[PDB]
């Protein structure tokens, strides 16, 4: 909390100037430490002000008003800071009451492809900067991958569902601006095996622990052991997990081997002692007979005959001494064998029942990345870990679409308008689109710049759904091919009554095989109405799209019957099944770091395109084609807030390019 808390909530170090700040304020950062701390405070305090009340515009005047000495003494620095923060959407972003009604006349013209959250975010910003903005959406609605099913009182998100913590999340600001009913998610998730029997807390804990440990092991393989290339191909996370599991099985057998190898060494040492003991009992049996016969010679006897008796008496007790010492050793080894045999090492590493419950955990991971672990990059799949938000995850209880819709207010949005071609040249751009209903009804849009927020799945299409003229440069298309675009589906089950644990938010289901681990493996209870939400992930996600809704809802009911009771599970009143891979405006769910890709590709995606000159030997043109979207933000991919931030990012870059950066003096 304080000025430092605002810097945190804005994903910035409170006591250090960022790279983006170094660019805009090179005079300050290269100057004396004293000035830097003034800058940092000014920056932080302004952020605090905006955050404290994000439902009203924060003007430069209102900012200077609430500053102390010696911070309010240099009004140009205060202005440079405020403007910078406004330009890059750190303050005055989203839906807020504007103090100074929008500028009379617009400057520059921007066409924005897609009205997903990334598009909408940028659109608002550009309009706020006084640019002419029009969004072209192929769908009959805004929000794109923020889909929300509504019917009567039933409300369920088919796309984005979870807010991944508020600590530094720009969506925290949005939620204060929009009527979002944010309910927390309770972390407890009881699992239920194929039969319907709950997993015992003994197993549950040991498998989960084993899962996390296997993950850490792959991370160790990657960074410490440098296990990243296999047959010239980049190692996947799937590969690495198998390799780790195999080494854990190898060790189990290694342990057993040297344990039994201990037994045979002692058992064979005992064998040699028994041979010695048998050979001694044989010689004792014989020597006793000899002494016996020596005593039968009744006295009186000469000295040699007397000596014989005495001699054999000594000889016999000497051999009786040895056998007694050897029976002592026999006692020691005989229990030492009962020692080693009493505590055997692990029988197996994991049983068939275990491996199944572990597969559910892999399904969780396959859901989180929206892809088979065989596709994920070992080295990079988790490259955005550092930038996770703090606080418990939440859900939008009134449905997520409320956000896009609220952002869409007061914006020029052409629905049912499918972009077919993007043409960009030194003098400007034209975008060719059609009407989705009558596909021969053609449209032409002339603009200074195009912001492309097309999903990566769309950009990936072969043959192209959108043609670029001139074609996108090799470096861009290679990035598009390299990058991964996943798939994840949802099944919405609406009932007349709650038959599940109302205090449980989510419960798993363990599949029969590895092949089907993703299939209906997770269920969500989040909403006011009796709605259960079932996930289809992993390899199963893609195959379940070629299967009819009735069969899917069938398998859903089947599972729920096994867990709650055959007569406790009624017929669903309304059902919806998402198909994100088949959806032509998505062509998948969200991006992942594919094997062979890295986080750097995400940067390549965000890099704008500058056309060639019209006349040869003419000055280097302005950049014309800009890219925003979830697949363009390295530190926050595959998320709403990520898309949101990328939109803000590009708006800033576009405005800088076409309205000029006054704050860099």
């Amino acid at each position: 909390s304080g000025v430092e808390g605002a810097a945190f909530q804005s994903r910035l170090p409170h006591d250090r100037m960022t790279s983006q700040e170094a660019a805009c304020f090179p005079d300050i950062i290269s100057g004396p430490q004293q000035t830097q701390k003034v800058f940092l405070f000014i920056r932080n305090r302004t952020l605090q002000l905006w955050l404290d009340n994000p439902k009203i515009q924060l003007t430069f005047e209102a900012t200077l008003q609430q500053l102390e000495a010696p911070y309010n003494s240099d009004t140009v620095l205060v202005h440079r800071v405020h403007s910078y923060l406004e330009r890059h959407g750190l303050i005055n972003f989203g839906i807020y009451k504007r103090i100074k009604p929008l500028p009379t006349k617009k400057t520059g013209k921007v066409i924005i492809i897609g009205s997903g959250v990334s598009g909408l975010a940028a659109a608002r910003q550009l309009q706020s900067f006084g640019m002419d903005v029009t969004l072209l959406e192929a769908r009959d609605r805004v929000g794109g991958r923020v889909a929300t099913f509504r019917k009567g009182n039933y409300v369920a998100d088919l796309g984005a569902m979870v807010v991944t913590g508020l600590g530094g999340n720009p969506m925290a600001v949005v939620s204060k601006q929009v009527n979002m009913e944010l309910a927390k998610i309770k972390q407890k998730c009881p699992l239920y095996e194929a039969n319907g029997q709950a997993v015992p807390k003994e197993k549950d804990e040991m498998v989960e622990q084993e899962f996390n440990r296997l993950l850490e092991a792959t991370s160790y393989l990657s960074h410490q052991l440098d296990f990243n290339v296999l047959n010239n191909k980049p190692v996947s996370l799937g590969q690495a997990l198998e390799v780790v599991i195999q080494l854990q099985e190898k060790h189990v057998k290694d342990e057993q081997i040297e344990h039994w190898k201990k037994i045979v060494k002692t058992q064979e040492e005992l064998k040699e002692l028994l041979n010695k003991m048998v050979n001694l009992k044989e010689k004792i049996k014989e020597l006793h007979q000899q002494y016996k016969e020596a005593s039968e010679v009744k006295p009186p006897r000469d000295i040699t005959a007397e000596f014989l008796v005495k001699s054999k008496h000594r000889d016999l007790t000497a051999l009786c001494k040895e056998y007694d010492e050897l029976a002592e050793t026999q006692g020691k080894l005989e229990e030492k064998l009962q020692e080693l045999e009493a505590n055997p090492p692990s029988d197996v590493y994991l049983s068939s029942r275990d491996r199944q419950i572990l597969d559910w955990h892999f399904a969780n991971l396959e859901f989180a990345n929206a892809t088979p672990l065989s596709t994920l990059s070992l080295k990079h799949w988790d490259q955005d870990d550092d930038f996770e938000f703090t606080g418990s995850h939440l859900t939008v209880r009134n449905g997520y679409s409320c956000v896009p819709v609220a952002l869409a207010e007061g914006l020029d949005i052409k629905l049912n308008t499918a972009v077919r071609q993007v043409r960009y040249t030194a003098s400007g751009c034209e975008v060719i689109a059609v009407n989705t209903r009558s596909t021969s009804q053609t449209f032409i849009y002339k603009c200074d710049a195009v912001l492309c927020t097309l999903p990566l799945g769309v950009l990936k299409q072969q043959p192209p759904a959108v043609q670029f003229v001139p074609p996108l440069p090799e470096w861009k298309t290679s990035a598009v091919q390299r990058m991964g675009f996943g798939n994840l589906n949802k099944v919405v089950l609406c009932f007349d009554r709650v038959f599940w644990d109302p205090s449980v938010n989510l419960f798993g289901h363990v599949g029969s095989t590895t092949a089907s681990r993703g299939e209906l493996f997770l269920f969500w209870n989040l909403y006011k109405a009796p709605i259960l939400l079932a996930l289809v992930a992993g390899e199963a996600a893609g195959i379940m799209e070629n299967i009819s809704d009735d069969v899917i809802v069938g398998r859903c009911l089947a599972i729920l019957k096994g867990i709650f009771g055959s007569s406790a599970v009624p017929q669903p009143k309304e059902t919806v099944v998402s198909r994100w891979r088949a959806d032509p405006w998505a062509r998948g769910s969200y991006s992942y770091v594919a094997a062979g890709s890295s986080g750097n590709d995400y940067d390549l995606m965000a890099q704008p395109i500058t056309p060639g000159p019209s006349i040869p030997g003419a000055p280097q043109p302005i950049p014309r084609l800009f890219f925003a979207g979830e697949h363009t933000i390295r530190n926050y991919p595959a998320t709403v807030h990520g898309a949101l931030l990328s939109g803000l990012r590009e708006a800033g870059r576009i405005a800088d390019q076409f309205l000029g950066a006054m704050y860099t003096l």
Binding site: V162, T164, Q187, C189, E208, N364, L365, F367, A368, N369, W381, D382, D384, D385, E388, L506, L522, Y592, V593, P637, A638, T639
Partner: peptide, 8 residues
């Protein structure tokens, strides 16, 4: 990515 994992 990782952030979507349940049962953390």
């Amino acid at each position: 990515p990782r952030g979507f994992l349940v049962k953390r």
